[PDB]
Amino acid sequence: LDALSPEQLVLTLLEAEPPHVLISRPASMMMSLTKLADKELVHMISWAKKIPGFVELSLFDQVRLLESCWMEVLMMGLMWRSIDHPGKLIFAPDLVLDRDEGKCVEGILEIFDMLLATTSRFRELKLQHKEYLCVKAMILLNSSMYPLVADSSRKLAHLLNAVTDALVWVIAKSGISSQQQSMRLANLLMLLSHVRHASNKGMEHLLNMKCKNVVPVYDLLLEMLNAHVL
Amino acid sequence: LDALSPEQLVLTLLEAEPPHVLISRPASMMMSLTKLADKELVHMISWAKKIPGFVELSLFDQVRLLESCWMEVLMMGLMWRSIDHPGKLIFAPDLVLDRDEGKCVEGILEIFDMLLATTSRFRELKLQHKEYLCVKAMILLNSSMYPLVADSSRKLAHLLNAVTDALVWVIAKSGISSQQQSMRLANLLMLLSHVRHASNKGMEHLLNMKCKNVVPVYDLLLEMLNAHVL
Numbered sequence: 049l050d051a052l053s054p055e056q057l058v059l060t061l062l063e064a065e066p067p068h069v070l071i072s073r074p075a076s077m078m079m080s081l082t083k084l085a086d087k088e089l090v091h092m093i094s095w096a097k098k099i100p101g102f103v104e105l106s107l108f109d110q111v112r113l114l115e116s117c118w119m120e121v122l123m124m125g126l127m128w129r130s131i132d133h134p135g136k137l138i139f140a141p142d143l144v145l146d147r148d149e150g151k152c153v154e155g156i157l158e159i160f161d162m163l164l165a166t167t168s169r170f171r172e173l174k175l176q177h178k179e180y181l182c183v184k185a186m187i188l189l190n191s192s193m194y195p196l197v198a199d200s201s202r203k204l205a206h207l208l209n210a211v212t213d214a215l216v217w218v219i220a221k222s223g224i225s226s227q228q229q230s231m232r233l234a235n236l237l238m239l240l241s242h243v244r245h246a247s248n249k250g251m252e253h254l255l256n257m258k259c260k261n262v263v264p265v266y267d268l269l270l271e272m273l274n275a276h277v278l
Numbered sequence: 279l280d281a282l283s284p285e286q287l288v289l290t291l292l293e294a295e296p297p298h299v300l301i302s303r304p305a306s307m308m309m310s311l312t313k314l315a316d317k318e319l320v321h322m323i324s325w326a327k328k329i330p331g332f333v334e335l336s337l338f339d340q341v342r343l344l345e346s347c348w349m350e351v352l353m354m355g356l357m358w359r360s361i362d363h364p365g366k367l368i369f370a371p372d373l374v375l376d377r378d379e380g381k382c383v384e385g386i387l388e389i390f391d392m393l394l395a396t397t398s399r400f401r402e403l404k405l406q407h408k409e410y411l412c413v414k415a416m417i418l419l420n421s422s423m424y425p426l427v428a429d430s431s432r433k434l435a436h437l438l439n440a441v442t443d444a445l446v447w448v449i450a451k452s453g454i455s456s457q458q459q460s461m462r463l464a465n466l467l468m469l470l471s472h473v474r475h476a477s478n479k480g481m482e483h484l485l486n487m488k489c490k491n492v493v494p495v496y497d498l499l500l501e502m503l504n505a506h507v508l
């Protein structure tokens with residue numbers, strides 16, 4: 049029970065943060081974004097396994113959550129990396145793209161603008177480091193409704209409730225009024241729907257891409273998940 | 279300021295609820311769903327105009343919110359209508375479909391299952407009538423980030439904050455602990471991302487449909503919005 053205690057949970061999530069990922073480049077923008085995502089997924093899996101209680105979930109729930117959440121978690125990390133730089137998306141060290149470079153690939157400008165506007169909202173709310181760590185973990189745990197709708201099910205609700213309690217604790221430490229605490233929790237959680245919207249649009253765009261101009265991220269992810277079951 | 283007061287706001291939303299809509303039927307499932315949506319949009323516009331402060335927003339914000347939110351608001355009303363009936367989707371009086379009827383149209387079963395699982399989550403949480411009225415209005419107001427990221431912008435934040443305060447008031451009246459209040463607010467708002475996910479999948483499916491087997495809902499909606507500007 050103390051591993052899921054707020055201060056301790058926050059500090060555990062801080063140490064599970066993924067490393068810096070480089071594209072390390074030797075049709076090009078899409079190849080770079082998909083190659084980058086495949087490299088980051090490796091570390092996302094590692095991060096998930098470090099969230100207190102995640103590996104105590106059934107294997108079925110662990111895999112369903114990872115397969116559903118990947119673009120959302122990737123995009124939430126992108127938004128945190130780009131928070132202090134209006135008009136820029138810091139995909140990686142590295143791979144810094146300006147909004148206007150989205151004009152070169154059909155369908156991408158729309159996705160860049162949604163990403164930049166969501167990032168702007170988190171900048172305006174002055175998202176804290178401790179709040180970002182809770183939110184990103186909530187994105188993985190709230191990704192698939194199925195796992196919630198028995199032993200493993202009880203557990204997922206409990207785990208999502210503990211991260212939420214941590215977020216509530218972080219907001220209370222800010223010293224603001226009870227009304228303002230309630231409002232800040234609502235403003236942050238309403239933004240989760242905008243991160244989900246971006247991920248859905250990104251996935252739709254990727255699925256509409258011609259196979260030759262892209263790394264097959266999803267199939268590579270499934271191989272990773274099979275590789276981690278065996 | 280008292281029009282946006284919690285008890286009064288809830289009671290105003292209750293009276294702005296749309297009427298029952300019938301398909302009134304004289305390739306068929308998709309025609310029925312799209313004909314139904316076009317009829318409901320007429321009343322959705324009317325409902326929006328009755329939410330305190332909505333018509334005080336700039337015309338640009340009113341139209342952007344309506345164009346972005348339509349499938350989400352339609353689907354949240356569907357989920358409320360179907361809440362007490364596992365395995366059934368009560369699209370309208372009527373037009374009651376069983377989960378298995380989704381098997382007949384390609385791509386629809388996936389959307390029916392997401393709708394039925396989200397509906398199941400709201401049933402498990404025992405969503406109250408007063409909570410549903412606040413949530414549906416929050417779905418319209420949180421639909422587009424753009425309008426938030428000056429006079430009309432200030433206003434949208436204020437309006438979204440008032441509905442949120444109403445929801446917080448409703449949850450507090452339930453008598454549960456402060457921790458439980460925080461947790462219930464989080465559980466409901468996290469479900470908004472699942473309603474957004476369903477709407478995105480529904481829109482993608484509709485856009486992939488062959489024009490002859492569907493009513494052109496979106497173009498009809500734009501005509502309604504132009505018809506209401508003029």
Ligand SMILES: O=c1c(-c2ccc(O)cc2)coc2cc(O)cc(O)c12
Nearest residue numbers: 081082085122123126159250253254
């Ligand atoms: O944003 C992305 C990303 C992406 C990559 C790394 C990140 O950290 C975040 C997103 C990957 O593939 C795409 C593929 C697409 O077709 C469209 C997209 O917007 C993306």
Ligand SMILES: O=c1c(-c2ccc(O)cc2)coc2cc(O)cc(O)c12
Nearest residue numbers: 311312315352353356389480483484
């Ligand atoms: O669910 C819907 C609805 C719909 C209709 C009425 C409602 O109250 C809610 C959703 C309309 O068009 C679609 C069109 C689609 O291609 C797929 C869908 O799932 C839908």
